[PDB]
Design a protein around this ligand. Structure first.
Ligand SMILES: N=C(N)c1ccc(CNC(=O)[C@H](CO)NC(=O)[C@@H](CO)NS(=O)(=O)Cc2ccccc2)cc1
Length: 247
C-alpha cells in the first residue's frame, strides 16, 4: 500500500495472510485474501499459478504483522486450491484473476469467528457501487515502488471507483481493461495498492453493508498518474464462486 495508514487486523477482520513454505524451512509472504465464509478464503490466481501445490501454503487469519505473531491469530493449511481455468496474462491485463482456498486447521476445523476474525459479505449479481464511490484496500504490500521489502505492519487506504469509460481512455489502459474488471484510484494519485497487495480485498460500503467488491490484481507501476489499480470484479464471478464452494 502506497501512502495510507497503518492499521490492525481488528479493523480488517476478514483479511487473510497467505504464505508459502520453502524446501529449506523459510516461509515467505505471497498474497492477501479475504474470508468469505468459515472454510473459504478468496484470493487471486496469479498468486499461485506458478506453484499450484496446496501443501506448500499457510493461511493466517487474525494476523496484524508480517513476520511476528498476534494473539488470537489462527493458522490454517490449504485443503483445496482452486484456480480459475481461464486465467491468462497479457501485456498488462490479468484475466479471471481469482482463486479460492478451502482452509482447515490441524484439527480439521475451519475458522472460528472472533473480534479479529470475521467474514466479509459477497456482492449481489451485477450490483456494484456507483463510480466515484470510496472504498478501502488492505495489504502487506510495498510502500514504495523502489522497496524490495514489505512493511511489517498491515496497512490500509481509501481509493475511489473509476468508470469503465474513463479507465478505457487512451492515456489510461485503453481496451486492455474489460467489464470483468474495476479500476480504482486516488484522485490525487498519491495512494494506491502495489506489489504484495495482490489477492487482497477492495471493500466498499454498499447500501450500509461492507461488501467485497474487488480483488487486488494488477496495474502499471504504483500510484502513477492516469494508471489506476485494476481489480477483479467479484460481482461477475458469483456463479463460479458458488459452483466451486459447494462440494
Ligand atoms: N494499483 C496498482 N498500481 C497495482 C500495481 C501492481 C499490483 C500487483 N500485481 C502485479 O504486480 C501483477 C503481477 O504480479 N503484474 C502487473 O500488474 C503488471 C502488468 O501485468 N504491471 S507492473 O509491472 O507495472 C507491476 C509493478 C512492477 C514493479 C513496480 C510496481 C508495479 C497491484 C496493484
Amino acid at each position: 500500500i502506497i501512502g495510507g495508514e497503518f492499521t490492525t487486523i481488528e479493523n480488517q477482520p476478514w483479511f487473510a495472510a497467505i504464505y508459502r513454505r520453502h524446501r529449506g524451512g523459510s516461509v515467505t509472504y505471497v498474497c492477501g485474501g479475504s474470508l468469505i465464509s468459515p472454510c473459504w478464503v478468496i484470493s487471486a490466481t496469479h498468486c499461485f499459478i506458478d506453484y499450484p501445490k496446496k501443501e506448500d501454503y499457510i493461511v493466517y487469519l487474525g494476523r496484524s504483522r508480517l513476520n511476528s505473531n498476534t494473539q488470537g491469530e489462527m493458522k490454517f493449511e490449504v485443503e483445496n486450491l482452486i484456480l480459475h481455468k481461464d486465467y491468462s496474462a497479457d501485456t498488462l491485463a490479468h484475466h479471471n484473476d481469482i482463486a479460492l482456498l478451502k482452509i482447515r486447521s490441524k484439527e480439521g476445523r475451519c475458522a472460528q469467528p472472533s473480534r479479529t476474525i470475521q467474514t466479509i459479505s459477497l456482492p449481489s449479481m451485477y450490483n456494484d457501487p456507483q463510480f466515484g464511490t470510496s472504498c478501502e484496500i488492505t495489504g502487506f504490500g510495498k510502500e514504495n515502488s523502489t522497496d524490495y521489502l514489505y512493511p511489517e505492519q498491515l496497512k490500509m487506504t481509501v481509493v475511489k471507483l473509476i468508470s469503465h469509460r474513463e479507465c478505457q481512455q487512451p492515456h489510461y489502459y485503453g481496451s486492455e481493461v474489460t467489464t470483468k474488471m474495476l479500476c480504482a484510484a486516488d484522485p490525487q494519485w498519491k495512494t494506491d495498492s502495489c506489489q504484495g497487495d495482490s489477492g487482497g480485498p477492495l471493500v466498499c460500503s454498499l447500501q450500509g453493508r461492507m461488501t467485497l467488491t474487488g480483488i487486488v490484481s494488477w496495474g502499471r507501476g504504483c500510484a502513477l498518474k492516469d494508471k489506476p489499480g485494476v481489480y477483479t470484479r467479484v460481482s461477475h464471478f458469483l456463479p463460479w464462486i458458488r459452483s466451486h464452494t459447494k462440494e
